[PDB]
Design a protein around this motif. Structure first.
Motif, PDB file in Angstrom:
ATOM      1  N   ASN A 172      44.962 -38.328  74.285  1.00 20.01           N
ATOM      2  CA  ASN A 172      45.787 -37.107  74.168  1.00 20.01           C
ATOM      3  C   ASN A 172      46.431 -36.797  75.494  1.00 20.01           C
ATOM      4  OD1 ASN A 172      43.263 -35.456  72.004  1.00 20.01           O
ATOM      5  ND2 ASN A 172      45.048 -36.769  71.462  1.00 20.01           N
ATOM      6  N   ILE A 173      47.725 -36.516  75.527  1.00 25.89           N
ATOM      7  CA  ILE A 173      48.398 -36.094  76.743  1.00 25.89           C
ATOM      8  C   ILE A 173      48.702 -34.621  76.793  1.00 25.89           C
ATOM      9  CG2 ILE A 173      50.252 -36.656  78.431  1.00 25.89           C
ATOM     10  CD1 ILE A 173      50.676 -39.224  76.828  1.00 25.89           C
ATOM     11  N   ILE A 174      49.395 -34.112  75.784  1.00 26.16           N
ATOM     12  CA  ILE A 174      49.891 -32.757  75.768  1.00 26.16           C
ATOM     13  C   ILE A 174      49.674 -32.278  74.359  1.00 26.16           C
ATOM     14  CG2 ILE A 174      51.883 -31.201  75.740  1.00 26.16           C
ATOM     15  CD1 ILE A 174      51.262 -32.352  78.557  1.00 26.16           C
ATOM     16  N   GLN A 175      49.051 -31.139  74.195  1.00 28.81           N
ATOM     17  CA  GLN A 175      49.127 -30.387  72.949  1.00 28.81           C
ATOM     18  C   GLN A 175      49.701 -28.994  73.248  1.00 28.81           C
ATOM     19  OE1 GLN A 175      44.972 -30.742  71.324  1.00 28.81           O
ATOM     20  NE2 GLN A 175      45.917 -32.213  69.911  1.00 28.81           N
TER      21      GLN A 175
ATOM     22  N   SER B 250      41.182 -36.942  80.486  1.00 32.98           N
ATOM     23  CA  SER B 250      41.039 -36.566  81.891  1.00 32.98           C
ATOM     24  C   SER B 250      42.019 -37.309  82.841  1.00 32.98           C
ATOM     25  CB  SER B 250      39.592 -36.752  82.341  1.00 32.98           C
ATOM     26  OG  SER B 250      39.280 -38.096  82.152  1.00 32.98           O
ATOM     27  N   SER B 251      42.465 -38.496  82.492  1.00 37.25           N
ATOM     28  CA  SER B 251      43.519 -39.181  83.237  1.00 37.25           C
ATOM     29  C   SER B 251      44.812 -38.403  83.449  1.00 37.25           C
ATOM     30  CB  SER B 251      43.844 -40.557  82.711  1.00 37.25           C
ATOM     31  OG  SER B 251      44.386 -40.584  81.394  1.00 37.25           O
ATOM     32  N   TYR B 252      45.085 -37.365  82.674  1.00 39.92           N
ATOM     33  CA  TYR B 252      46.334 -36.602  82.856  1.00 39.92           C
ATOM     34  C   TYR B 252      46.191 -35.254  83.438  1.00 39.92           C
ATOM     35  CZ  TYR B 252      47.636 -40.086  79.626  1.00 39.92           C
ATOM     36  OH  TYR B 252      47.828 -41.213  78.969  1.00 39.92           O
ATOM     37  N   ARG B 253      44.958 -34.867  83.768  1.00 40.98           N
ATOM     38  CA  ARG B 253      44.715 -33.567  84.298  1.00 40.98           C
ATOM     39  C   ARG B 253      45.591 -33.243  85.502  1.00 40.98           C
ATOM     40  N   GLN B 254      46.408 -32.185  85.448  1.00 39.74           N
ATOM     41  CA  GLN B 254      47.332 -31.912  86.591  1.00 39.74           C
ATOM     42  C   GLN B 254      48.255 -33.127  87.004  1.00 39.74           C
ATOM     43  OE1 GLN B 254      48.220 -28.623  88.397  1.00 39.74           O
ATOM     44  NE2 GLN B 254      47.207 -28.256  86.435  1.00 39.74           N
ATOM     45  N   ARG B 255      48.577 -34.013  86.050  1.00 38.51           N
ATOM     46  CA  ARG B 255      49.495 -35.116  86.256  1.00 38.51           C
ATOM     47  C   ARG B 255      50.587 -35.248  85.139  1.00 38.51           C
ATOM     48  NH1 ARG B 255      49.598 -40.834  85.914  1.00 38.51           N
ATOM     49  NH2 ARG B 255      47.896 -40.843  84.377  1.00 38.51           N
ATOM     50  N   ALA B 256      50.340 -34.649  83.995  1.00 40.08           N
ATOM     51  CA  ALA B 256      51.302 -34.632  82.884  1.00 40.08           C
ATOM     52  C   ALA B 256      51.714 -33.222  82.592  1.00 40.08           C
ATOM     53  CB  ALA B 256      50.664 -35.221  81.619  1.00 40.08           C
ATOM     54  N   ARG B 257      52.978 -33.026  82.282  1.00 40.74           N
ATOM     55  CA  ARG B 257      53.384 -31.717  81.833  1.00 40.74           C
ATOM     56  C   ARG B 257      54.521 -31.839  80.882  1.00 40.74           C
ATOM     57  NH1 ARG B 257      56.887 -29.781  86.503  1.00 40.74           N
ATOM     58  NH2 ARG B 257      56.080 -27.655  86.145  1.00 40.74           N
TER      59      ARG B 257
ATOM     60  N   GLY C  49      66.214 -28.545  72.154  1.00 44.95           N
ATOM     61  CA  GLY C  49      65.744 -29.529  71.188  1.00 44.95           C
ATOM     62  C   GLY C  49      65.286 -30.802  71.891  1.00 44.95           C
ATOM     63  N   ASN C  50      64.845 -30.667  73.127  1.00 44.56           N
ATOM     64  CA  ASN C  50      64.376 -31.780  73.938  1.00 44.56           C
ATOM     65  C   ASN C  50      62.861 -31.589  74.315  1.00 44.56           C
ATOM     66  OD1 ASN C  50      64.391 -34.124  75.409  1.00 44.56           O
ATOM     67  ND2 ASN C  50      65.131 -33.143  77.307  1.00 44.56           N
ATOM     68  N   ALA C  51      62.026 -32.499  73.849  1.00 47.79           N
ATOM     69  CA  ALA C  51      60.582 -32.494  74.209  1.00 47.79           C
ATOM     70  C   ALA C  51      60.436 -33.534  75.265  1.00 47.79           C
ATOM     71  CB  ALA C  51      59.722 -32.799  72.984  1.00 47.79           C
ATOM     72  N   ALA C  52      60.326 -33.097  76.524  1.00 45.50           N
ATOM     73  CA  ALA C  52      60.381 -33.958  77.728  1.00 45.50           C
ATOM     74  C   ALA C  52      59.026 -33.959  78.426  1.00 45.50           C
ATOM     75  CB  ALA C  52      61.485 -33.482  78.658  1.00 45.50           C
ATOM     76  N   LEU C  53      58.362 -35.104  78.384  1.00 38.79           N
ATOM     77  CA  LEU C  53      57.064 -35.287  79.029  1.00 38.79           C
ATOM     78  C   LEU C  53      57.241 -35.937  80.396  1.00 38.79           C
ATOM     79  CD1 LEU C  53      53.979 -35.525  79.018  1.00 38.79           C
ATOM     80  CD2 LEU C  53      54.298 -37.760  77.817  1.00 38.79           C
TER      81      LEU C  53
ATOM     82  N   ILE D 150      55.317 -37.419  83.685  1.00 32.48           N
ATOM     83  CA  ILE D 150      53.994 -37.914  84.147  1.00 32.48           C
ATOM     84  C   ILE D 150      54.194 -38.310  85.616  1.00 32.48           C
ATOM     85  CG2 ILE D 150      52.295 -39.736  84.050  1.00 32.48           C
ATOM     86  CD1 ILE D 150      52.704 -39.768  81.012  1.00 32.48           C
ATOM     87  N   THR D 151      53.358 -37.826  86.529  1.00 30.55           N
ATOM     88  CA  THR D 151      53.578 -38.160  87.940  1.00 30.55           C
ATOM     89  C   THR D 151      52.639 -39.241  88.374  1.00 30.55           C
ATOM     90  OG1 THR D 151      52.112 -36.314  88.574  1.00 30.55           O
ATOM     91  CG2 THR D 151      54.340 -35.902  88.504  1.00 30.55           C
ATOM     92  N   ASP D 152      52.981 -39.900  89.480  1.00 32.38           N
ATOM     93  CA  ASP D 152      52.124 -40.936  90.041  1.00 32.38           C
ATOM     94  C   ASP D 152      51.649 -41.987  89.020  1.00 32.38           C
ATOM     95  OD1 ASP D 152      51.121 -42.010  92.318  1.00 32.38           O
ATOM     96  OD2 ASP D 152      49.306 -40.775  92.328  1.00 32.38           O
ATOM     97  N   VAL D 153      52.640 -42.653  88.377  1.00 34.28           N
ATOM     98  CA  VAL D 153      52.401 -43.499  87.240  1.00 34.28           C
ATOM     99  C   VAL D 153      51.492 -44.646  87.636  1.00 34.28           C
ATOM    100  CG1 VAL D 153      53.597 -45.061  85.693  1.00 34.28           C
ATOM    101  CG2 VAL D 153      54.466 -42.756  85.927  1.00 34.28           C
ATOM    102  N   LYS D 154      50.573 -44.968  86.757  1.00 35.75           N
ATOM    103  CA  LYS D 154      49.609 -46.053  86.933  1.00 35.75           C
ATOM    104  C   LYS D 154      49.787 -47.079  85.862  1.00 35.75           C
ATOM    105  CE  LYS D 154      47.211 -43.325  89.722  1.00 35.75           C
ATOM    106  NZ  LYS D 154      47.686 -41.949  89.329  1.00 35.75           N
TER     107      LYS D 154
END
Length: 126
Positions: free
Chosen positions: A46-49, A62-69, A78-82, A84-88
């Protein structure tokens, strides 16, 4: 019928960079945040709910905590834009955007992450 679309299906990014991936959905007049769910996931993580204008963190991987928004300013377009910082390397794979708004639909996005060997070793698990 309600359909989500992805103008850009494939992203190729470098290890350590930031990326913004997008799904588009129809907004008739004005967006009503009370009627909207945006649920991003990748490969069973899960990334974003985002439910009724709020990000629910309860089952975020937990891999996205304070890294995905989710970029909320984009929703009225009408744009759902995810973002993700510091991509791994573990960010490489198939994302799904599951959008509910008077209807529900999803699409798949593929992300490739390029990295040199030393970087690949950084989070190489056993």
């Amino acid at each position: 019928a309600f359909t989500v679309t992805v103008p850009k299906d494939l992203y190729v990014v470098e290890y350590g960079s930031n990326m913004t991936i997008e799904c588009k959905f129809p907004v008739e007049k004005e967006l009503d945040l009370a009627a909207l769910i945006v649920y991003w996931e990748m490969e069973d993580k899960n990334i974003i709910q985002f439910v009724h204008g709020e990000e629910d963190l309860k089952v975020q991987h937990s891999s996205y905590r304070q890294r995905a928004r989710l970029l909320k300013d984009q929703l009225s377009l009408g744009n759902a834009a995810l973002q993700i910082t510091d991509v791994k390397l573990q960010d490489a794979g198939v994302y799904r955007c599951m959008i509910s708004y008077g209807g529900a639909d999803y699409k798949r996005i593929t992300v490739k992450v390029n990295a040199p060997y030393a970087a690949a070793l950084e989070h190489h698990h056993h």
